[PDB]
Scaffold this active site. Structure first.
Site: not given
Lengths: 145, 158
Positions: B12, B14, B17, B66
């Site tokens: 995720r 936010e 990354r 995913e």
């Protein structure tokens, strides 16, 4: 002769973790030795690195013999890392290093470095002892047919 | 027939990354480990799935889809899955309880009950697999190093 040879320091694991592992192995019809030259006679050597595995000379020499049966007999070796950092086993650093030779010596470092990197079971990567021991028994059992 | 990518990261953005994920990807790069740059068709094309469970993994249907797909490739294509628990605890992911369960539950309100069952099954199956719980490591750096060596070995699998 045997399916499995266990190498462990009794003080750390015999009455606890080892009894659960042996119970699960038994229940899957895995064979082992009930208490050093028996190592040769064992297809798999499960090595239980614990906090005081490095304090016993019998342990270390058991490991050198396990290592020799790896290089000479294609004995399969599964290392268990039991409340012991695996990098500290490979590099003889930190806590495990200190214990290592407060306790030849280079054949030992060679075995510890060699076995520490093999596909093994790091309790810190597993939800529980029970689940890890379960996967280990199925891996030994399919490694035995 | 060889797989295009060593690793498929499922995460995720936010949450991760700019921080944890950038360090892990640098480590992967440093060991010549390939991975996709960012989508479910890539998943089957990867030898290893690294699932980074974070607080808001639960709030993204793209992540959860995913995860359903990773699960399918795990049982069908022998894909190796490594879960990571980044400031969530494994059993909350495994059982959809506490913080993680709350975000997950809020997400499902506008979604198929069926899809939801998929998500629960994937979460439960992956969460019990051997992996990297940050609570159990001295630091993010130390954990990412161990994980990258792990991934490198797994690329020796036939």
């Amino acid at each position: 002769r045997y399916d499995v040879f266990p190498s462990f320091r009794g003080e750390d694991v015999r009455d606890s973790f080892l009894s659960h592992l042996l119970k699960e192995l038994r229940g899957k019809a895995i064979t082992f030795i009930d208490d050093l030259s028996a190592i040769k006679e064992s297809r798999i050597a499960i090595v239980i690195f614990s906090k005081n595995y490095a304090s016993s000379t019998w342990c270390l020499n058991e490991l050198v013999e396990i290592h020799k049966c790896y290089t000479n007999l294609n004995q399969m070796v599964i290392p268990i890392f039991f409340h012991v950092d695996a990098s500290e086993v490979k590099k003889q650093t930190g806590e495990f290093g200190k214990v290592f030779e407060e306790t030849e010596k280079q054949s030992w470092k060679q075995a510890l470095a060699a076995v520490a990197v093999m596909a093994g079971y790091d309790l810190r990567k597993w939800p529980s002892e029970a689940a890890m021991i379960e996967e280990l028994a199925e891996d030994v059992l399919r490694k035995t047919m």
